[PDB]
Amino acid sequence: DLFAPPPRMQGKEGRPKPHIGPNYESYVKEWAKTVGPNSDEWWAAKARETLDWYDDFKTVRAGGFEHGDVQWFPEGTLNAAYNCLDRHYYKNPKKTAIIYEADEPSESREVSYEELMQETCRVANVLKSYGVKKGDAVSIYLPMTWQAAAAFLACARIGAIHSAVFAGFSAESLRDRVNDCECKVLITTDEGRRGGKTIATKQIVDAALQQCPLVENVLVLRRTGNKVPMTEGRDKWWDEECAKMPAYCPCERMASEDPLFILYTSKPKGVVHSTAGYLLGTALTLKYVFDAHPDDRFACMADIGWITGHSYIIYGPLANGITTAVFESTPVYPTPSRYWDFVDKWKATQLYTAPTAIRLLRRMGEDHVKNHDLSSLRVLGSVGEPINPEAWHWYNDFAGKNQCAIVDTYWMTETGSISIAPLPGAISTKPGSATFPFFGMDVDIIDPQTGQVLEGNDVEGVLVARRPWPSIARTVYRDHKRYLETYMKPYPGYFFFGDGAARDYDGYMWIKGR
Amino acid sequence: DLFAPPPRMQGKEGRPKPHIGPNYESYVKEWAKTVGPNSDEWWAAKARETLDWYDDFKTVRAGGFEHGDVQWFPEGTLNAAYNCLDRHYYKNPKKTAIIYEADEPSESREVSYEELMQETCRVANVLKSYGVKKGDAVSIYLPMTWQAAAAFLACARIGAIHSAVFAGFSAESLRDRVNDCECKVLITTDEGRRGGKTIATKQIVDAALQQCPLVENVLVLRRTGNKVPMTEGRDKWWDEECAKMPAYCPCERMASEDPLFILYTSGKPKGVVHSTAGYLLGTALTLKYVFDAHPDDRFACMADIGWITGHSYIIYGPLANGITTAVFESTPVYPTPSRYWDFVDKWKATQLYTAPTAIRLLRRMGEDHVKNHDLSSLRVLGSVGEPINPEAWHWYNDFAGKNQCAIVDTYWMTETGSISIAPLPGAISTKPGSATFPFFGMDVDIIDPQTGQVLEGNDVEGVLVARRPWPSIARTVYRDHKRYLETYMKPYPGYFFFGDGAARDYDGYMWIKGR
Amino acid sequence: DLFAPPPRMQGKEGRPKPHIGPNYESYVKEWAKTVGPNSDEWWAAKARETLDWYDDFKTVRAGGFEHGDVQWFPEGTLNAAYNCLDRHYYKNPKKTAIIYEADEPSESREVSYEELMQETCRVANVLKSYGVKKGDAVSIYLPMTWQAAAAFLACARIGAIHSAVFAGFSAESLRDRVNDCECKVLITTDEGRRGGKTIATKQIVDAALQQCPLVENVLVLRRTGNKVPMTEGRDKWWDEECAKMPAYCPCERMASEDPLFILYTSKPKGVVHSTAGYLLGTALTLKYVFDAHPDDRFACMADIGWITGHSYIIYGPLANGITTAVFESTPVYPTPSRYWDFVDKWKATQLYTAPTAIRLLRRMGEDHVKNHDLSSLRVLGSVGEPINPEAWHWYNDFAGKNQCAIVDTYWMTETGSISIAPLPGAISTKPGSATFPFFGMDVDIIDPQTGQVLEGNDVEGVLVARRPWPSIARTVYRDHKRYLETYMKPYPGYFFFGDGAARDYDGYMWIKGR
Ligand SMILES: CCOP(=O)(O)OC[C@H]1O[C@@H](n2cnc3c(N)ncnc32)[C@H](O)[C@@H]1O
Ligand SMILES: CCOP(=O)(O)OC[C@H]1O[C@@H](n2cnc3c(N)ncnc32)[C@H](O)[C@@H]1O
Ligand SMILES: CCOP(=O)(O)OC[C@H]1O[C@@H](n2cnc3c(N)ncnc32)[C@H](O)[C@@H]1O
């Protein structure tokens, strides 16, 4: 029940050679440099190689779990939108940043880095004309359209802290998150289209804003064009506001520990992520866990309202300068072959889905996946919950045709990027196992009965992290006490994931879950 | 009718050697490095040599005409007030930044770089106390007084976007521009003195502010000292506010593409927006090369600071170069039609930059006012604003330069930022009424309006277009980017539309027919 | 009556070697480099060696007395809180930043650099949540508790100009200072404890704020825990607000000439100090005048509401990365041996007091100091007024046991740091004499009758400074005309101290005073 890296992950058949490989020893050799007291040099070199800095940093890391003063590269200044848009636009403006798969397949198209950069700059200029300053919160209530990315980056361009809310959340949840983030600006659509169904996003927005006094400006994207109520003064059309603005906006120089965004967990708790550490973590996980290469076309099927959508739809892939996919539909619309039709049409090199979608597709039958070419795929990703051996085997056999590496990535919103996953070109996978910790992750197992670390293999308990990592959450927005109580107080000296986990005789990690 | 550069432009008679010369081939050699796909090295070298940067840039240029996302040196940070005041103050504080020629000739005096920097810092501190932030618009309604420059630079010191309004504008024009820029602070004077005449500037300001709700603070310069109405709380005297402030203010670190200023074109007036680094570089380079400016030179542009000529070649260009500039408060015919030449003789001006209207008026005023003046310190005579007739050109050459000064016919607009087509004085043989050759970074062409295609070769006529962006090009129209694109970019896709008909003769010289 | 540097200041008996010594010639050699037209190299080297800069400076100095446009290192950017907390926290987090001697001796404890940094960052986050921006004034009405050092530095961390008011000032003085600085945020305690006595700081604050319209937020430190009135909305508890905030805050990159703080002289006149020049001056005076070394324990017993508390309790010692003492009590509480009990308990290496406290202790009798060890002491400092020969001799004989160098430091709030003092390891002292000018100080004596500088030795007149020094006051807050009239108009070309002074035949300076 062991699956070595496939030939597509061995650099054969014209496929790119893996970044780390070919076996477990190479992963160990590289991972030893990323943890421990001598790991500062590796992290400094990676931060300078991966991200573009306006000012260089001096200190690599500081702080800890006990007080929630975690710092990474504090003296450096950078911009997330510069690292995700501007440098790649300068290198190659015509390269596709986003493959936008609309709800209707005929409406899908490619958005270049130039178009995405121009839209981001227009939205950033609109936000600046609204009075949005560095450190201000901007709520984003958007469906899975490509402009959402622009919206995100727009905030990241001006130093605003964006707070994304799942589209289709009720008026109460949206109101709670908007009130907690204390935003004065909300970005939303008139309506959303998903699975051939209409989401009345603007009606929900009006119902929620009836109880959100601090919101003064609403920017409304005309996604569908159907009639929606628009309050005079408060509501403005995205296209009309952006037509008045120039297609370029200067980047605000952010400290490394400036909060990049707030993401509310589904009182809602707002996990806060800073700029440089989170960006470095997601870029490195995208490059290594999925073996991304410059010409790759990443296809993550999550939602931008989720942490997976934050990391491996927007920030991670665009920081790497590769093509990412924004999928506006459901896996069974119009037909349960939608994922595979999309992969064949766009020649996706990686696929990142959730076990729930895989299970639904498996329940939908084999005729929808059996006759598809695929074969541009190299890495198949799973995230969100433990994947059963049957679902794992269906994913391997039909979506990858036994020629793609299957990565079971375990992480949370508070970890920022992937924590435990197999390296596709090095690690032999076990079905339903998140195998080994990522770079900078020193995870162990504590016995909850005694609170002591269970050394060795073939043990079971609660999963903890020994040391902070660059992409860890820094606080809970205006609720640092809750942050410390949830993640740092249960086991002092360790970060508490809250997931029961086991390590088998081979050292492989098995996440039991919450 | 060809005029080679005179001996004063040949480095002889103790005059400085020209930066570019002595003939057309040298101009071509330097210009070829400033255009095309291999010109990034030249522009990066010039940007690093001419301007002082707080942070270095990585990219030289990006963007284009189609969407209006033009970028020059985007990653670099700098300050216009630092590059126009502080570095020259550090090098030589006692050097004259401004020769202020007052309306009354006995009231004229030299303002040093130290005094100008201190005044700029006091006004910047006042504006900061008013709550003005980086990116905020500040309206300026000032006559041709030297403190106006300070006011300009004051905004540029704190990241404020200044919006200059010509002091001759009525209450309605001032109100329209002030409302469009959405400023909360207006810098103005009690009264102006031009041609012995009084401009009731504060009265017009009150009439306009009756319909300008967003303006909360008015800073009033006591220019004449006559009684004017002063609203309690809203209006404060410039001297009283500046006395409470320190004489130094820190320079705010500004991105290259941060908007330096808004200038409204004379239905709704269009606010042409200029960024900082590209515009500063363009104006400094045009000032150094088109007028052959040298460190000890005394530049005399007699335009108004309410127009782009005053923005570029009274304030930003000459002060970025660290030379003496002139602020002329009077008219060409006050007190007598010899005022220009009396000024040039008294201050030993090395360059003159006027408009064909003033030269035509002086020519109609008779030769008795110019024939008996020395004027030998002059080396370059500049004309800007409209095509200059051969008779006016010859009167300018023979009477003002005494046939010993180069005549530059500089063609450009507010949207170009700096001079686009002009003769290089030490290299180009001029033809009267001709803006001869494009400046560095300008790749101009003639397009047939009926067909829309570029008319290659010589002896062609059509509309003037620019193939590629240049550092000092306007970035947008304030809150009206659609108007910017429609006016300058959609008429001929892939090109920048000047709106001016132009012809190129057999020698390659450009002739601007005009709008 | 001449006193050569003692063996404790000669590098003997295991004591650190003095930075400058052993005689007057060495002081002259080092001081000649710090004044004159060729002193820019020395000051540039010292600025780059002493302070951590975000951006390097190009110009060393500019401006002058006549217009009050003094500039030092204008193009450089830095942060005072970074230089006082972050770099030392990065080098050694567990080192004691503050020895907090509480009013009750049993309540005293050591605050480490990590704890001080975390408290400063929490307060900075609270202030940022109050809307405090760079350049905004924040009033501080705090007793001699260690958190005051945090509050100060919190402002310095975010570019806020802190304005400290002596605790125990009446409601009218507090109101005048708060109204003049135009602050919108006030930091104070519920009550203060000094000399076993209670100071109703919150009651005075309420009485003052009844006439301070611009104040919108009050942060109240629960120093004693006794019941005080708290206005709903306006007043919030320090601990409650700080518990919601993360323990790290990014440092605002500040221009060198950005105003660090406003200190009102006891209409109140707010002396304004910029960041880089003041920080450099205080750090250099602390290092050289007191011969501070990395492991030293500086004990300045002034008040943080005074300029001495600004320079040699908070900024100077913490910039040097050494331990500083925050003394909450009086010299005679609970007994007149409190100073010497504290010195013996914490092994203070330097003591910096005022002549009034020394005279009070001398009046209290010799039985309180005669039996104390006091061996760790090396330097004894006096500041505030001319110290009588009898008081000087008592200080030398009983507090130092004729084994400590006695430095008489003359300076004002407008000089920022010490102007005239003996270098302890080099200068032979005379009782009641501030001997020689400090680095960058070129003082002279002007005859007030004629206004001309009196050349040579054995002259008397008014003390003037020929050239600006880095730590000189830049202005009086919104009263620059008063600043010029007080300090620069009486003798054009010079800085007027306002103190009559004499120089004897040996070149020693004798300050007559106001
Ligand atoms: C990235 C989503 O972050 P969140 O939406 O905050 O959910 C985080 C929570 O999902 C669960 N989980 C995620 N990935 C896996 C996995 N590979 N195997 C098992 N369980 C998993 C786990 O319980 C975790 O703590
Ligand atoms: C600098 C003033 O800028 P503006 O006030 O925006 O006027 C810009 C408009 O003036 C005209 N013009 C300016 N210089 C010349 C010239 N040398 N020869 C011919 N015509 C000229 C032209 O029509 C242009 O388009
Ligand atoms: C640091 C206190 O600054 P301030 O509270 O502003 O008082 C400043 C004023 O105290 C006096 N003074 C301070 N130190 C001494 C000293 N060593 N010898 C004599 N007189 C001194 C002097 O009159 C000065 O001008």
Side-chain angles (χ1 to χ4, degrees), chain A residues 5 36 49 56 58 60 115 128 140 150 174 214 230 242 285 291 316 330 353 355-356 376 391 401 423 458 467 470:
Chain A
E49 271 137 40
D56 200 6
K58 179 175 177 182
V60 171
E115 180 178 3
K128 291 223 264 141
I140 296 181
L174 173 61
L214 290 181
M230 299 265 305
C242 281
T285 50
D291 214 72
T330 80
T353 80
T356 169
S376 52
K401 292 182 172 178
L423 292 191
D458 218 30
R467 312 290 315 141

Side-chain angles (χ1 to χ4, degrees), chain B residues 308-309 384-387 409-414 500 512 515:
Chain B
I308 192 66
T309 316
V384 58
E386 58 251 80
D409 196 10
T410 79
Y411 166 82
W412 55 299
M413 324 155 61
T414 308
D500 282 295
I512 301 299
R515 312 295 300 198

Side-chain angles (χ1 to χ4, degrees), chain A residues 66-90 92-196 198-226 228-266 268-309:
Chain A
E66 167 168 11
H67 297 104
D69 52 335
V70 166
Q71 305 140 62
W72 283 88
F73 322 107
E75 304 93 350
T77 70
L78 77 176
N79 193 270
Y82 183 89
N83 277 278
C84 296
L85 302 166
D86 299 45
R87 62 186 183 161
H88 314 304
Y89 161 80
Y90 296 150
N92 33 45
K94 296 288 148 154
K95 182 177 198 178
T96 297
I98 297 177
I99 286 166
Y100 163 57
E101 186 71 27
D103 201 46
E104 298 299 322
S106 72
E107 289 159 16
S108 307
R109 75 179 182 92
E110 283 178 312
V111 187
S112 65
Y113 267 102
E114 174 179 1
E115 180 178 3
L116 187 57
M117 164 127 162
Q118 289 161 343
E119 191 82 303
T120 296
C121 285
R122 286 184 205 102
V123 177
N125 283 326
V126 171
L127 296 169
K128 291 223 264 141
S129 77
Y130 288 162
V132 174
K133 300 290 182 197
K134 172 186 165 186
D136 286 353
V138 178
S139 270
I140 296 181
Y141 191 63
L142 284 173
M144 266 289 282
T145 188
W146 71 264
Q147 294 100 329
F152 277 46
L153 299 166
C155 296
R157 189 172 198 85
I158 61 176
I161 313 161
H162 75 77
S163 180
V165 185
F166 275 109
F169 262 173
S170 69
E172 290 67 56
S173 308
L174 173 61
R175 165 208 72 203
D176 292 346
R177 288 153 176 73
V178 159
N179 279 336
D180 191 78
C181 75
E182 282 160 320
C183 66
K184 309 183 234 155
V185 173
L186 163 74
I187 304 175
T188 189
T189 39
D190 48 7
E191 292 173 328
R193 291 295 287 178
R194 211 226 176 217
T198 292
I199 326 161
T201 49
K202 190 51 166 60
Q203 315 246 63
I204 294 164
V205 154
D206 296 326
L209 290 188
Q210 253 162 324
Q211 285 188 285
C212 295
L214 290 181
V215 179
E216 295 160 6
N217 303 97
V218 179
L219 194 64
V220 191
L221 179 72
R222 208 189 311 259
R223 167 64 183 79
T224 71
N226 298 320
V228 292
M230 299 265 305
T231 300
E232 161 71 40
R234 187 191 70 187
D235 301 345
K236 300 288 186 182
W237 289 110
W238 167 308
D239 51 278
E240 299 177 3
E241 299 290 85
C242 281
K244 297 184 273 165
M245 291 307 153
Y248 179 76
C249 181
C251 289
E252 180 76 30
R253 295 163 114 82
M254 323 300 297
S256 301
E257 288 297 330
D258 272 330
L260 182 61
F261 65 85
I262 302 150
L263 192 41
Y264 284 93
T265 67
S266 55
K269 147 153 76 56
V271 170
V272 174
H273 282 287
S274 65
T275 305
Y278 169 87
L279 200 61
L280 181 63
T282 68
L284 286 178
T285 50
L286 190 272
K287 179 177 176 171
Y288 284 111
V289 171
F290 299 97
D291 214 72
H293 280 80
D295 280 331
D296 277 353
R297 292 166 293 281
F298 200 71
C300 180
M301 311 312 270
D303 204 285
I304 45 92
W306 198 18
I307 190 65
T308 316

Side-chain angles (χ1 to χ4, degrees), chain B residues 10 15 52 87 102 158 178 203 226 229 260 320 372 395 409 481 485 503:
Chain B
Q10 297 163 10
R15 302 312 172 107
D52 275 339
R87 61 189 182 156
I158 63 177
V178 159
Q203 303 275 15
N226 297 330
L260 182 59
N372 288 126
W395 190 103
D409 196 10
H481 195 68
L485 294 178

